[PDB]
Amino acid sequence: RFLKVKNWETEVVLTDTLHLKSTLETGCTEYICMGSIMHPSEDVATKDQLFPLAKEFIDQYYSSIKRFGSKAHMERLEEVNKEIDTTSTYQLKDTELIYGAKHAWRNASRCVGRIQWSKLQVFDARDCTTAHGMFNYICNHVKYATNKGNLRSAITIFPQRTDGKHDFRVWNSQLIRYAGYKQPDGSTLGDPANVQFTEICIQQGWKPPRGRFDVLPLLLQANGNDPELFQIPPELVLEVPIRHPKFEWFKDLGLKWYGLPAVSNMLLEIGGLEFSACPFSGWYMGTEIGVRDYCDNSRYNILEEVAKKMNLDMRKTSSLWKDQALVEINIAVLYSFQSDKVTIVDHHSATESFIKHMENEYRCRGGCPADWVWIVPPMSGSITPVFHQEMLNYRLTPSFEYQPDPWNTHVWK
Amino acid sequence: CPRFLKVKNWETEVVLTDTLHLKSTLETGCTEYICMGSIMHPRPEDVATKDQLFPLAKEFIDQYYSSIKRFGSKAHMERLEEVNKEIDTTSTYQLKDTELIYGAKHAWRNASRCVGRIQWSKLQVFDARDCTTAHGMFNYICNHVKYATNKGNLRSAITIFPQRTDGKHDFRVWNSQLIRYAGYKQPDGSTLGDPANVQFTEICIQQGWKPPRGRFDVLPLLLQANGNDPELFQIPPELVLEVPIRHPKFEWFKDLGLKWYGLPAVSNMLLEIGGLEFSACPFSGWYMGTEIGVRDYCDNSRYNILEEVAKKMNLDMRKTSSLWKDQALVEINIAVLYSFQSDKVTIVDHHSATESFIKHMENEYRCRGGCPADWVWIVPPMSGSITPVFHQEMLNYRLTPSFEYQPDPWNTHVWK
Ligand code: HEM
Ligand code: HEM
Ligand SMILES: Cc1cc(N)nc2cc(-c3ccc(OCc4cocn4)c(CN)c3)ccc12
């Protein structure tokens, strides 16, 4: 049955037919909704499971290019059946690889940035065999995507999983991240989100400069071997010093962030195939930049410190001192990136774009999967147009999936 | 489903195990292939039959006698047999006063969208099942207002009018809240007063109300008893406690002329206990600051309160990325908390409320086996990620007794 979604601000009502085409489960049941669980519940598939999934993807592909049932389509289906038959797997044509990767982004229910979905630069790295080659492919990705600040969406796709013992993995969660150091007293130098990975890198031989914004080395695993450390040429890492248009002391917080958000620990699934290394990158929404959790000193947060320098009453919560210092930190982030002509988007324009994207998707595609819990920005939610937009969340393939951290699965040698 | 379900707090890494979800009763709207958690709502003659009512009554009576540690007792088995005989010979049954009180507290305890549930057991229940006329509803509602308000030291309360029978004799409060401000659509397309209430204001005017046509005209009560046509009553203005909105730093903020009422009192919802339907059950607590909807008022023509506040703050409003909207919204929310506290009217900020709810949710998982929660509604409309509920995973499921939506009465009422 069709389903309606209403916008309660504009009273616009959209009809979803696209959800009838999903068959990956969401994790909810008729009796329990799990829409706020982050991962709501071995990975190597047999030929038996493979061809259905491959056939489904070849079918929607040849339907995307208005040739469903053509000689080309009939033949491509036979070609893939033969290849699954003899090799227990198959290889995507370049066109399929590009179409499938764009559509994984299009189907990412949690991504507010999807209006750009079809402008994606796809780098085919399926010939890669070693970590040195990964490092070369990733430097090219970084250099292309960054583009002296005029950022450009890209993805680099390394060879697909075979038996599971030969995975390609980028052990970093992002290509560019800052190191976090657990301290003597107990606090944290650098980015606290990365303390575990930082200790893994030190244990692997990395010599930490032990600063606040130490770019972490790339830790790269090719064909299931042990991972190897590589330093990204510093000239490829574009950074933005964070300053404030009104507060001239903000620059004295010593803060900066990197320009390129490039997520490197997810799994790309296309037509039954699993690409366990597929770093993809776009540009930031201002609210993502997690500099607020840095420690200015040995006791006070970037929130606490900013509100301190703003001379706010921090004795009680009802003064909303956290809320004021949050807005100012985000003003500073957007002002700084814009002053350096580094691509960034504010959460107002981003959510506005996404509503317009939803309209497009319901017109041409009969729906758009969307995860309200993740689409709604992490501040000022109800004054953005997504807050009052009803959304239907469902799981379409090709897709980006979660996968275990490699240091929990890997048998060293 | 499996027996255990785990939720994770990603800020603290605490994991909680939920077994209460196995007692969930009705559908959520979601399926295994689609999630409807952001959908707001996933004949009058149709009431529960004998065959439908029996198991629902039994389920509730069992749950009640279990709660008072008398399950399987003589008194439990006798109450069961008495209910079964009322249903058999009258097609319905009457709750005991104890059962009504327990039912109402647990509809609140089970309200997955309420951040305020840490208070659920401290709820004054007013039994109004002897009411027969709209004048008597007015009496009961005036005493609810006066009790709940308590000169600014607000106390949560619910007043429960007779249950539904054949669906042709419903009691209804036509107001959406006991206290709301009138909104008047103008011939030029602008709005005076509160635009959220334009439709109901027009119903009141059509029902004979003479409006003052001001910014903050308290609407009249529109009260239907026993399925009769509703009738209009003015709340005595001395019962409506109000707070002028001023700002601790901005002297000019008082010049906006804003005020709001103290007592949030929702009156269009349906209370379901043991299969019985109480279509009129106004209930009230106190506000979280972010609720107070003064920001949508028009200061002048095309400028609402957000725009006007940003104008008086001299913020650049030419581009969104200056975050002028965000900045103005914080100051509005500061003034609202400052005003209620200065006048000693009960109010809670979103930081305190969500912190209390996390404490409450952990206790419920501990002592009840779970706590249904609707993240989409629990997380506040501003500064979500810096409140403790943003990073908290939740399970949403529908337990009974419950508060439910019902269609507006003007859509279904047969006029006499
Ligand atoms: C082009 C500009 C883009 C913007 C502004 C953007 C914005 C966002 C934001 C704000 C989130 C949520 C982040 C959070 O809450 O922590 C998100 C999630 C996501 N983005 Fe986008 N994004 C962009 C591009 C892309 C691209 C190019 C891809 C892949 C081809 C992509 C794939 C995803 C995925 C898969 C998620 C979900 C992660 C998950 O399921 O855990 N995004 N995006
Ligand atoms: C004691 C102070 C209370 C506070 C601070 C509070 C807070 C809230 C808030 C902020 C919401 C969501 C509002 C929105 O998103 O627009 C809500 C929803 C709700 N509250 Fe509470 N509440 C309180 C008392 C009560 C009481 C006494 C009852 C019933 C006995 C109740 C029942 C509900 C219900 C049923 C909903 C959801 C309504 C719906 O689904 O449309 N609340 N509450
Ligand atoms: C291409 C891209 C651009 C952008 N501008 N933003 C992005 C954000 C994510 C993203 C967000 C949250 C995620 O979930 C874990 C998490 C850690 O911290 C907060 N969430 C994951 C999973 N790797 C990815 C992924 C891709 C992004």
Ligand SMILES: Cc1cc(N)nc2cc(-c3ccc(OCc4cocn4)c(CN)c3)ccc12
């Ligand atoms: C329900 C929900 C919605 C949403 N839209 N997003 C979420 C993001 C997280 C999440 C989990 C881990 C994270 O990372 C570690 C951490 C940060 O702060 C405390 N722990 C972060 C941010 N990094 C976010 C958790 C839940 C989320």
Ligand SMILES: Cc1cc(N)nc2cc(-c3ccc(OCc4cocn4)c(CN)c3)ccc12
């Ligand atoms: C006792 C109580 C206290 C309080 N402090 N707050 C409350 C808020 C609601 C509430 C919130 C949203 C609702 O519905 C969606 C909506 C319409 O407009 C804005 N939200 C409804 C249904 N009447 C009730 C209900 C009860 C509340």
Ligand SMILES: Cc1cc(N)nc2cc(-c3ccc(OCc4cocn4)c(CN)c3)ccc12
């Ligand atoms: C997905 C969602 C989550 C949430 N947590 N809450 C919501 C609140 C509304 C809603 C509906 C009607 C309303 O009433 C009239 C209106 C004003 O602005 C737009 N509609 C209001 C606010 N009064 C809010 C709609 C959706 C909501």
Ligand SMILES: [Zn+2]
């Ligand atoms: Zn769901």
